[PDB]
Amino acid sequence: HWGYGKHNGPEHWHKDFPIAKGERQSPVDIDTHTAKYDPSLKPLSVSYDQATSLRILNNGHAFNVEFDDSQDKAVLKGGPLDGTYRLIQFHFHWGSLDGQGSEHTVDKKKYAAELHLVHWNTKYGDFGKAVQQPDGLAVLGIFLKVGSAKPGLQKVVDVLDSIKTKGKSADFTNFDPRGLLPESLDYWTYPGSLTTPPLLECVTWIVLKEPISVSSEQVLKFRKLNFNGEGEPEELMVDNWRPAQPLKNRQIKASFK
Ligand SMILES: O=C(O)/C=C/c1ccc(O)c(O)c1
Ligand SMILES: [Zn+2]
């Protein structure tokens, strides 16, 4: 199957998922000088106070912290969005070195990692139906740079040993995702896609301008995870990021002047 290796990595995905060469693929490079401020963009509304996390799972490509999305608990609205989007899970993409790891880039700059808070449009009823729609998902992207530790990330770092290999999961209740947000909600937004197969073109991307800082020790722990399952040759889970894709006929809008 697909992955991030030399023989099954991003350059190969188009053979099983032709949409990989589509008109609105993600990630993209955000050219800060070309992005245009859009004064009509409403401020983002991130309501995570009633968030209910459930479990953390190593799925062989990244680890996902899953939330109960059977009710309007944790929701994203406003900004470029029409309607209410419910948080279903968050995950990260990271590198084998601090100089790479993010999927979106800013003026070609690569960050050490990137957090994706995934939300689906409640007008579509469930996640599976939402990914089949052009405005089905809203993903909040947050860059991570290596520096000071992020306290709100430590509980995730400490449970990683329990989900080292593909297919392993662990209880992960009472985790507050608000601890992963930067101070400012200034953002860039554009229409795009899932960045892993099936690469569906169903995402309104909202990428925050302000990165969060995490420590070298925190990201080092991410790099101890495994892509393989237990009892299989160890392949470290590093560089699970897709590189920037052609912008094509799209404009990236900024919420700030
Ligand atoms: O196939 C699915 O069921 C979900 C895929 C998925 C979900 C969230 C992402 O950011 C992404 O790249 C892919
Ligand atoms: Zn992602």
Q: How far apart are CA 143 and CA 103, in angstroms?
A: 9
Number of domains in the chain: 1
Method: X-ray
Radius of gyration of the chain (CA): 17
Q: How far apart are CA 43 and CA 56, in angstroms?
A: 30
Q: Which amino acid is at 234?
A: E
CB atoms within 10 A of CB 183: 7
The Å distance, Cα 92 to ligand 2 centre, comes to 6
Tell the residue nearest (CA) to atom 6 of ligand 1.
Answer: 194
Q: How far apart are CA 15 and CA 126, in angstroms?
A: 28
Mutation pick for ligand 1 pocket among 194, 199, 245 (CB with most ligand atoms within 8 Å): 194
Residues having CB closer than 6 A to ligand 1 are 116, 118, 139, 194-196, 198
Tell me the CA distances in angstroms from 125 to 64, 94, 179, one per residue in order: 21, 31, 28
- State which residues form the domain around 82: 1-257
Do 119 and 76 meet the contact criterion of CB atoms below 8 Å apart? yes
- CA 109, distance to chain mean position in Å, is 17
Dihedral, CA of residue 145, residue 146, residue 152 and residue 157, to nearest 10: 120
